[PDB]
Amino acid sequence: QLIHKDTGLIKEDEVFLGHIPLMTEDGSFIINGADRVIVSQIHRSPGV
Amino acid sequence: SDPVRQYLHEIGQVPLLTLEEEVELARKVEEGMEAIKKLSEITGLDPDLIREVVRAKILGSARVRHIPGLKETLDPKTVEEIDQKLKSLPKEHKRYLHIAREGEAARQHLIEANLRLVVSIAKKYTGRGLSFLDLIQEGNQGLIRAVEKFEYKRRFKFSTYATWWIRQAINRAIADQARTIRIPVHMVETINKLSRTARQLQQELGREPTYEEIAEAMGPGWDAKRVEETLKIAQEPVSLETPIGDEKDSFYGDFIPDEHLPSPVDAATQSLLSEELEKALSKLSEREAMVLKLRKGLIDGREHTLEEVGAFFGVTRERIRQIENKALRKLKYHESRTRKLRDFLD
Amino acid sequence: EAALRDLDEEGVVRIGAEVKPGDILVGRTSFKGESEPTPEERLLRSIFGEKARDVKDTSLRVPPGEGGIVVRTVRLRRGDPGVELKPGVREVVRVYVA
Amino acid sequence: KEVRKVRIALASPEKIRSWSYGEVEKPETINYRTLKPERDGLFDERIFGPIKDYECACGKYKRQRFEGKVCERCGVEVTKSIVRRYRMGHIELATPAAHIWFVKDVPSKIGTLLDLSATELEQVLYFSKYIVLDPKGAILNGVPVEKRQLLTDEEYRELRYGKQETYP
Amino acid sequence: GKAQFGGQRFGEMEVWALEAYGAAHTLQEMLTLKSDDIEGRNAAYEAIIKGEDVPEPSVPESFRVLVKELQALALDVQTLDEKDNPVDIFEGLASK
Amino acid sequence: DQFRVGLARLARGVRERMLMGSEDSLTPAKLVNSRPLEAAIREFFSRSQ
Amino acid sequence: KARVYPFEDDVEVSTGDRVAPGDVLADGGKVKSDVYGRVEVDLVRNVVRVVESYDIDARMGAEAIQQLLKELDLEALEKELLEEMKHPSRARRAKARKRLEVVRAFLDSGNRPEWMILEAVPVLPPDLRPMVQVDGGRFATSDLNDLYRRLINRNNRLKKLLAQGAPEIIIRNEKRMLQEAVDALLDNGRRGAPVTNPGSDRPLRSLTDILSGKQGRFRQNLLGKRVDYSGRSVIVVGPQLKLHQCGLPKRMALELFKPFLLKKMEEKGIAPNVKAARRMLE
DNA sequence: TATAATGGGAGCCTCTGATGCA
DNA sequence: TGCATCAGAGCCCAAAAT
Ligand SMILES: [Mg+2]
Ligand SMILES: [Zn+2]
């Protein structure tokens, strides 16, 4: 929803943002026809 | 150490103008231009040439150079002559020189005081293929255009007029410089329209549009073929230094063969063809081998007309065609027997 | 005709054919880049009396060391239902060799 | 003759211009429609040579009978296309520019010669500070401006354009 | 690479091996006729199919690239003879 | 994470579109260009390490 | 801070002119200036102002540095530095040594120090920075072309800003941008942020990068090369071999020795000639 | 070609050598 | 004059890279 804080006018709409890749049943992706895996990354935990 | 930060700091050293200060500089600039017109009339001298001499003396000795349109080379000798000619004017005429000088001075100041305006407009155009400083400099160019065209009488503040010209300058720069393969500004406009259109269609259709759907949305004159051709023309090159792999070890260009330079096999083959051709031409008479060499360009590289080969051997244009035909006839006969030249026909 | 034996009407190798290195998988012609034939070719063409063709053989062949039985072919042209290729591409052929 | 030695030396602007077969006056590369090189651009055949052997761009002179000829119409020499690997162009700068190797390689060669530190050479080259060639009798803060002195922007303007202030 | 119909890389360490063996002509072949010497590699192929022995190699094209790349860096690289006179490895093509 | 990045770029475009054009007639469809988001996700899946 | 010099009649100087104490201002020489300064001719107040200031020559950038380098007398500087080599302090002698070594370098070589500043910038031949159509009809091009393009654009703009009498702030910005652009072409990342193509974090590849490093011209193409008449395969033990032998697969051997094989196939009658022989092995 | 608009944005090893401070 | 601090210099090969 777009709002004009001065006027109060409100126009609301559902906008299309493109596509997001879906994971298949086995935990992989199909990207341009080829099956891909996203490998987990170990790193330093945030904190003090 | 940071060129943007430095420029911003330099920008911050010229105070912004009061409405009064702005009108004063704008007023002096307009008046200075009217003065240059008058000096042209009085002297019968080029107004542009006059403007460069006036401008040369205001900016100082630092900047003195030839201007592409001026007929005379602009150097201290010539600018002294013309400046001395202007100072040789009567008082009521010589006053316009003083007016013009102060006009150029005010032009400088007016430009300098508005530089932060260009920055605030340019920052919005980043990411379109021009660097921030580049956008600032083209934007500055528009600011200069605005100062020359500004009419202070209209009572509009300067920022209003400048903003149009600055936006214009930045957009022209992006249209002119952003592509390795340069595209005419109008064609860039057409390409961008097609982008917006396709984006509208994808925003209403929930998927990328086909070529035909884009063609409807573009109206008459547009079919699917033209949408495709326009997109083809709009393709930007990709770097030869584009990485292959997750190591830094290889480039995309390393995988691209060279089709221009002949391969060893091709060079060898062409050489063998020349040697077999000479072998077949030795089985003719020297004259009928020479007629063919002269007619097909093997000698000197050019193909001679029958009139030229005939005049060179002392025979008639019909005669040289005849000795050429019997040469070629003998050539065809020897080939069917020995089959030497067949394999080079691929 | 020995070279073209296993190609169908459209130029794609037939399903079930055995392909070996050097064999044509998909036949293709490309228009010759404009060039002036060397005087050797001028003389050769003149000797044999055969026009140099406008097109060259760009056909896809089995690379060295590869080959097998053709189990599938996919052909996608431009202007046929459901398929749109990247700009400039008239048609795409895929040959699956097992 | 046989190559026994390889010399490497600095190149004068004159020598760089003698190498050059033309000045590249335009950022253009190749024409978006014809795909032929753009005149005066980075790929120009009039500068770096013909794309095709013994054939000019427009195609008036197509064979080796002309070698060394420069087509009046298209401006291209008829020679081997191999020359596009060899022939150099040049860009004529509006302001001299320092060659960074002689700046950033420590100790700087330019800096060492002129007795300028790394910071000073940086400040002049990248336009943070002025350097005085001719004081022309200037004096700043009671002491005379000495040649090769570095001035800030504030210092230079007060010297060059004078000091003033405006009070609201 | 195999997919490009590529040649094997005879790298820095392979060159050391040929050097330690003192195989100067084998090494020179690797550096010229079997690689970027254009005139040389053409001549070698033609010689072998004709039964002649392979000709003396010429300047490797990547050395010409190096010279021109250093000229692009404003350094003048000059090949000299024993008399310290210039030798033109571009064979007149790049000089006016 | 890459989604968040593409979203930040899309937001830059929104603020930039909220200055230009008519300050009166604007919808969300006119304000949003989704290309930055699509690109961030497309970049992650194809070219990420 | 300026001096005011009123005038009744015509003024012989004009606004913007630079002036020294004593320079004639107006009235045929009657009124003249007491200070060093810049002339401001006031037509309202009927007065010639002279703002106290000097004609000082002070410059920025490579133009200034090139000048100081042009004015170097290296012979003279050698003499001074030899005298410095006698000074008791080790550091004094050390600094004079390093300086003197650069001086002597230029002296023996015959190189002028000002050549380290560029006026004409060389442009590499196009085939070494190609624009090529790849397989799909798409174009692929070397990064140097974008680096040259940045350079050319800024230079041309500099010529235009100069012709139009832009303020010093604008001309200065362009000049520092011009220095930075030459820097990027020659060694990118060397000074400042590496210039990159849009929508990529990848530094463009400059001449220094092409020359140096593991991927550079020296180590990649000069001290090692890919070669013809070569092959590779998996190895397997051959106990039956004599020490001077190896097993070589015939299909490999046919390729490795292919030209020789073409010649031999001609001597024996297997093919009419080399061209036919090659076509038969294909 | 004219309401006015006036200062940006991202950020995370070892050895060697010169340089700037006790 | 003697000592930190920092900038800039390096960090295996070939194969492959779908
Ligand atoms: Mg490797
Ligand atoms: Zn021509």
CB contact under 8 A, C65 and G282: no
CB contact under 8 A, F49 and B124: no
Q: With beta carbons under 8 A apart, name residues in chain B contacting A13.
A: none
Q: Under 8 Å CB-to-CB from B191, ≥6 apart: which residues? A: B183, B230, B233, B234
Cis peptide before G167, with omega less than 30 degrees from 0? no
User: Which nucleotide is at minimal CA–C1' distance from A32?
Assistant: I18
CB B146 within 8 A of CB B168: no
Resolution (Å units): 2.8
Is B252 contained in some domain?
Answer: no
CB B211 within 8 A of CB B228: yes
Query: How far, in Å, is the centroid of ligand 1 from the Cα of C62?
Result: 29
CB contact under 8 A, G226 and E15: no
What is the DSSP annotation of G117-151?
A: EEEEEEE--GGGS-EEE-TTS-EEE-HHHHHHHHH
**Both tokens assigned to D50:** 């013909």
Of B95, B180, B243, the CB nearest to G146: B180
With residue C71 as reference, give the H or E element that holds it: strand C68-76
Strand partners, G51: G2, G38
A34 Cβ nearer than 7 Å to chain I strand = yes
CA distances to D6, D7, E96 from E85, in Å: 11, 11, 18
Running DSSP on this structure, what letter comes out for residue B16? Answer: P
Strand partners, D89: G123
With residue G177 as reference, give the H or E element that holds it: helix G168-186
Is B249 contained in some domain?
Answer: no
Task: Answer whether A18 touches F (CB < 8 Å).
Answer: yes
Structure-derived torsion over alpha carbons of residues G25, G26, G31, G35, reported in degrees to the nearest 10:
-20
Running DSSP on this structure, what letter comes out for residue G40? Answer: E
User: Which nucleotide is at minimal CA–C1' distance from G94?
Assistant: H18
SS3 D136: coil
B249 labeled part of a ligand binding site = yes
CB B116 within 8 A of CB B12: yes
Query: How far, in Å, is the centroid of ligand 2 from the Cα of D32?
Result: 21
Task: Give exposure, G224-260, as e/b (b: 16+ Cβ within 10 Å).
Answer: bbbbbbeeeeeeeeeeeeeeeeeeeeeeeeeebebbe
Running DSSP on this structure, what letter comes out for residue G203? Answer: B
Query: How far in angstroms lies nucleotide H19's C1' from the CA of residue D112?
Result: 14
SS3 D150: strand
Q: Could you tell me if B141 and B21 lie in one domain? A: yes
- Domain boundary residue, one of B179, B209, B244: B179
CB D40 within 8 A of CB B182: no
Reduce the secondary structure of G211-268 to three states and give it as a string. Answer: HCCCCCHHHHHHCCEEECCCCCCCCCCCCCCCCCCCCCCHHHHHHHCHHHHHHHHHHC
Q: Which residue is nearest to nucleotide H7 (CA to C1')?
A: B8
Is B255 contained in some domain?
Answer: no
Query: How far, in Å, is the centroid of ligand 1 from the Cα of G29?
Result: 83
Selected residues 217-236 of chain G with any CB under 8 Å from a CB in chain D: none
Residues written for chain A: 48
CB B303 within 8 A of CB B346: no
Tell me the pairing of strands D5-10 and G37-42: unpaired
| Residue pairs between chains C and D whose CB atoms are closer than 8 Å | 3
Of B102, B111, B131, the CB nearest to G167: B111
Running DSSP on this structure, what letter comes out for residue B345? Answer: G
Q: With beta carbons under 8 A apart, name residues in chain E contacting D101.
A: 73
- Nearest residue in E to B256, CA atom: E4
φ/ψ region of D51 (left if φ > 0, alpha if ψ in -120 to 50, else beta) reads alpha
Dihedral sign (CA B207, B211, B212, B216): positive
Of D7, D10, D83, the CB nearest to E93: D83
How many CB atoms are closer than 10 A to CB G14? Answer: 22
Q: Which residue is nearest to nucleotide I18 (CA to C1')?
A: A34
User: Which nucleotide is at minimal CA–C1' distance from B143?
Assistant: H6
Q: Could you tell me if B115 and B219 lie in one domain? A: no
Is B11 contained in some domain?
Answer: yes
Q: Under 8 Å CB-to-CB from G16, ≥6 apart: which residues? A: B57, B58, B60, B101, B104, B105, G38, G39
| Residue pairs between chains A and F whose CB atoms are closer than 8 Å | 36
Dihedral sign (CA F14, F19, F21, F25): positive
What is the DSSP annotation of B128-171?
A: SSS-HHHHHHHHHHHHHHHHHH--GGG---HHHHHHHHHHHHHH
B88 labeled part of a ligand binding site = yes
Is B243 contained in some domain?
Answer: no
What homologous superfamily is domain C1-98 in, according to CATH? RNA polymerase II, Rpb2 subunit, wall domain (2.40.50.150)
In a 13 Å sphere around the CA of A10, the CA atoms on its Cβ side amount to 3
Which protein residues have their Cβ less than 7 angstroms from some atom of strand H? B 2, 4-5, 8-9, 11-13, 16-17, 22, 113-117, 119-120, 123, 126, 132, 149-151, 154-161, 163-164; D 106-107, 117-119; F 23
Q: Domain of B219: which CATH number?
A: 1.10.10.10
Domain residue spans of chain C: 1-98
Strand partners, D20: D88
B215 labeled part of a ligand binding site = yes
CB F12 within 8 A of CB F3: no
How many CB atoms are closer than 10 A to CB G47? Answer: 18
- Domain boundary residue, one of B236, B252, B274: B236
CB E29 within 8 A of CB E14: no
Reduce the secondary structure of C5-44 to three states and give it as a string. Answer: CCECCCCEECCCCEECCCCEEECCEEECCCCCCCHHHHHH
Distance from the first to the final alpha carbon of chain F: 14
Distance from the first to the final alpha carbon of chain C: 25
Q: With beta carbons under 8 A apart, name residues in chain F contacting A32.
A: 46
Q: How far is B342 from chain C (nearest CA, A)?
A: 8
**Both tokens assigned to F3:** 């989604």
Task: Give exposure, B116-139, as e/b (b: 16+ Cβ within 10 Å).
Answer: ebbbebbebbeeebbbbbbbbbbb
User: Which nucleotide is at minimal CA–C1' distance from B168?
Assistant: H1
Q: Could you tell me if B80 and B224 lie in one domain? A: no
Q: How many Å separate Cα G213 from the centre of its chain?
A: 19
CB A17 within 8 A of CB F44: no
CB F26 within 8 A of CB F15: no
- Among residues B140, B114, B106, B161, the alpha carbon closest in space to that of B11 is found at B114
Q: Under 8 Å CB-to-CB from B1, ≥6 apart: which residues? A: G192
- Among residues B121, B106, B109, the alpha carbon closest in space to that of B165 is found at B121
Tell me the pairing of strands G139-141 and B238-239: parallel
CB F12 within 8 A of CB F34: no
Query: How far, in Å, is the centroid of ligand 1 from the Cα of E15?
Result: 16
Q: With beta carbons under 8 A apart, name residues in chain E contacting B257.
A: 4
How many CB atoms are closer than 10 A to CB G59? Answer: 19
Q: With beta carbons under 8 A apart, name residues in chain B contacting D27.
A: 177, 182
CB D155 within 8 A of CB D140: yes
Q: Which ligand is nearest to the CA of D62?
A: 2
How many CB atoms are closer than 10 A to CB B69? Answer: 10
Hey, what long-range contacts does G201-205 have (CB within 8 A, 24 or more apart)? G202/B239, G202/B241, G202/B243, G204/B241, G204/G143, G204/G146, G204/G147, G205/B241, G205/G142, G205/G143, G205/G144
Strand partners, G5: G48
How many CB atoms are closer than 10 A to CB C12? Answer: 21
With residue B189 as reference, give the H or E element that holds it: helix B185-205
Q: Do chains F and C touch (3 or more CB pairs under 8 A)?
A: no
**Both tokens assigned to D87:** 């022939």
Distance from the first to the final alpha carbon of chain B: 65
Q: Do chains E and D touch (3 or more CB pairs under 8 A)?
A: yes
Q: With beta carbons under 8 A apart, name residues in chain G contacting E30.
A: 225, 227
For residue B38, give the amino acid letter: K
Q: Under 8 Å CB-to-CB from G164, ≥6 apart: which residues? A: B144
CB G159 within 8 A of CB D94: yes
E-strand stretches of chain D: 5-10, 20-23, 88-98, 130-134, 139-140, 143-144, 150-151
Q: How far is D85 from chain C (nearest CA, A)?
A: 21
Q: Could you tell me if B165 and B27 lie in one domain? A: yes
Q: Give me the phi and psi of G5, to 5 degrees please.
A: -125, 95
For residue E14, give the amino acid letter: E
Sheet holding E75-80: strands in order across?
Answer: D5-10, E75-80, E86-87
Tell me the pairing of strands G31-32 and G24-26: antiparallel
Q: Could you tell me if B17 and B116 lie in one domain? A: yes
Chain B neighbours (≥3 Cβ pairs under 8 A) are: A, C, D, E, F, G
- Among residues C45, D66, C38, D81, the alpha carbon closest in space to that of B300 is found at D66
- Measure the CA angle with vertex D77, ends G134 and B261; round to 5°: 35
Q: With beta carbons under 8 A apart, name residues in chain C contacting G137.
A: 88
Q: Do chains G and D touch (3 or more CB pairs under 8 A)?
A: yes
Q: Give me the phi and psi of G52, to 5 degrees please.
A: -65, 125
With residue B185 as reference, give the H or E element that holds it: helix B185-205
Q: Could you tell me if B82 and B223 lie in one domain? A: no
SS3 B289: helix
Q: Could you tell me if B226 and B205 lie in one domain? A: yes
CA distances to B51, D27, D109, G17, G123 from G152, in Å: 28, 6, 27, 35, 11
Q: Could you tell me if B190 and B74 lie in one domain? A: no
With tokens 């630092």, the residue in question is: B62
Segments forming the whole domain that contains residue B36: 1-179
Is B92 contained in some domain?
Answer: yes
Running DSSP on this structure, what letter comes out for residue D32? Answer: T
Q: How was this structure determined?
A: X-ray
Dihedral sign (CA B293, B297, B299, B304): positive
Q: Domain of B89: which CATH number?
A: 1.20.120.1810
Task: Answer whether E72 touches G (CB < 8 Å).
Answer: yes
- Among residues B231, B208, B228, B227, the alpha carbon closest in space to that of B218 is found at B227
Tell me the pairing of strands E75-80 and D5-10: antiparallel
| Residue pairs between chains C and G whose CB atoms are closer than 8 Å | 7
With tokens 């006059």, the residue in question is: B50
B254 labeled part of a ligand binding site = no
Q: Which residue is nearest to nucleotide I15 (CA to C1')?
A: E1
Q: Give me the phi and psi of D100, to 5 degrees please.
A: -60, -25
| Cβ neighbourhood burial of G143 (10 Å; 0-12, 13-18, 19+) | buried
Instruction: Cite the annotated binding site of D for Zn(2+) by residue number.
Output: 56, 58, 71, 74
Task: Answer whether A34 touches F (CB < 8 Å).
Answer: no
Is B16 contained in some domain?
Answer: yes
Is B246 contained in some domain?
Answer: no
Q: With beta carbons under 8 A apart, name residues in chain B contacting C40.
A: 270, 273-274, 277, 298
Query: How far in angstroms lies nucleotide I1's C1' from the CA of residue G96?
Result: 18
Please tell me the total count of domains within chain B.
Answer: 3
Measured to protein CB atoms, the chain H nucleotides within 7 Å are 1-9, 18-20
Gap between the Cα atoms of G157 and B142, Å rounded: 12
- Measure the CA angle with vertex D148, ends D147 and D149; round to 5°: 90
- Domain boundary residue, one of B179, B196, B217: B179
